[PDB]
Design an enzyme around this catalytic site. Structure first.
Site, short mmCIF file in Angstrom:
data_model
loop_
_atom_site.label_atom_id
_atom_site.label_comp_id
_atom_site.label_asym_id
_atom_site.label_seq_id
_atom_site.Cartn_x
_atom_site.Cartn_y
_atom_site.Cartn_z
N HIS A 254 1.61 20.11 -8.87
CA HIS A 254 0.23 20.23 -8.40
C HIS A 254 0.17 20.59 -6.94
O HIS A 254 -0.88 21.05 -6.47
CB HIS A 254 -0.57 18.97 -8.72
CG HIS A 254 -0.39 17.82 -7.83
ND1 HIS A 254 0.41 16.74 -8.11
CD2 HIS A 254 -0.99 17.56 -6.64
CE1 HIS A 254 0.31 15.87 -7.11
NE2 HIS A 254 -0.53 16.38 -6.19
N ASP B 160 4.84 17.11 -13.93
CA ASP B 160 4.35 17.52 -12.60
C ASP B 160 5.47 17.75 -11.61
O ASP B 160 5.59 17.07 -10.62
CB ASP B 160 3.37 16.47 -12.10
CG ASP B 160 2.59 16.89 -10.87
OD1 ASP B 160 2.61 18.09 -10.52
OD2 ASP B 160 1.97 15.99 -10.23
N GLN C 164 -2.58 10.17 -0.99
CA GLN C 164 -2.82 11.61 -0.78
C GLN C 164 -2.01 12.07 0.41
O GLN C 164 -1.94 11.40 1.43
CB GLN C 164 -4.32 11.83 -0.53
CG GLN C 164 -5.07 11.99 -1.85
CD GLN C 164 -5.24 10.71 -2.65
OE1 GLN C 164 -5.83 9.71 -2.22
NE2 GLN C 164 -4.75 10.68 -3.90
N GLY C 165 -1.35 13.18 0.25
CA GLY C 165 -0.44 13.74 1.22
C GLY C 165 0.98 13.35 1.00
O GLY C 165 1.86 13.97 1.60
N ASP C 166 1.25 12.34 0.17
CA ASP C 166 2.59 11.97 -0.24
C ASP C 166 3.06 12.71 -1.48
O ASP C 166 4.26 12.66 -1.79
CB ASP C 166 2.69 10.47 -0.51
CG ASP C 166 2.51 9.63 0.75
OD1 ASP C 166 3.02 10.02 1.81
OD2 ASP C 166 1.85 8.55 0.63
N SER C 167 2.16 13.38 -2.20
CA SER C 167 2.52 14.05 -3.43
C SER C 167 3.73 14.95 -3.24
O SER C 167 3.90 15.60 -2.20
CB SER C 167 1.38 14.92 -3.97
OG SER C 167 0.32 14.10 -4.40
#
Length: 224
Positions: free
Chosen positions: A41, A84, A177-180
């Protein structure tokens, strides 16, 4: 990372930051000199040219070695949150040495055992919906949550055999969020997953959900 502490130099020699349009975006793991593993993603369908990888630094914006992308390949079965993972090829090869190294991967067919300790790292927000992000890499240690429990939180269909879960029942320690796309490792520093999704960040009774390296080794090994 919510509830985290600063990573030390050399804690995750393989971790890369992935900037997009010059700003924070996600993380990844350096597999070899020209290959990064991240979440699908993070990259699927976006303009490739927007991304910049940086290896060998605790910061996203200086130090270490950078590269642009030459190609992006998502898992052939990527769908919704499922499967993912993506393989990124780098325009600039990145040598191991110093604080750069390549990831060792969880064995094919392995599945993190419920209650075992995992550590996740990244440059994402420190609260749900936070707008600011730390300069230097954070990490947090959380236990694996059984898939059965995870399916009780999210629904049976929502958690697949290519996902595993981790977090504390009380909340307060999680990826965000931002660690994905960044790494989650077992207690030996072997790469067991990539940050994928969850219901907010660090909420009680909603585990973080991770793309499982042990489950997705055929794809990784074929294209790395």
């Amino acid at each position: 990372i919510v509830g985290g502490t600063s990573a030390s130099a050399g804690d995750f020699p393989f971790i890369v930051s992935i900037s997009r349009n010059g700003g924070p975006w996600c993380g990844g793991s350096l597999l070899n000199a020209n290959t990064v593993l991240t979440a699908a993603h993070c990259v699927s369908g976006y303009a490739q040219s927007g991304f910049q990888i940086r290896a060998g630094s605790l910061s996203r914006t200086s130090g270490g070695i950078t590269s642009s992308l030459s190609s992006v390949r998502v898992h052939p079965s990527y769908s919704g949150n499922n499967n993912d993972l993506a393989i990124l090829k780098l325009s600039t090869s990145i040598p191991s040495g110093g604080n750069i190294g390549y990831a060792r991967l969880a064995a094919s067919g392995s599945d993190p055992v419920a209650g075992s300790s995992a550590t996740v790292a990244g440059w994402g927000a420190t609260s749900e919906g936070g707008s600011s992000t730390p300069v230097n890499l954070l990490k947090v240690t959380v236990p694996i949550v059984s898939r059965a429990t995870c399916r009780a939180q999210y629904g049976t269909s929502a958690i697949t055999n290519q996902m595993f879960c981790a977090g504390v029942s009380s909340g307060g320690k999680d990826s965000c969020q931002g660690d994905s796309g960044g790494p989650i490792v077992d207690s030996s520093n072997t790469l067991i997953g990539a940050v994928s999704w969850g219901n907010g960040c660090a909420r009680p009774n909603y585990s973080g959900v991770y793309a499982s390296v042990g489950a997705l080794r055929s794809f990784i090994d074929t294209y790395a």
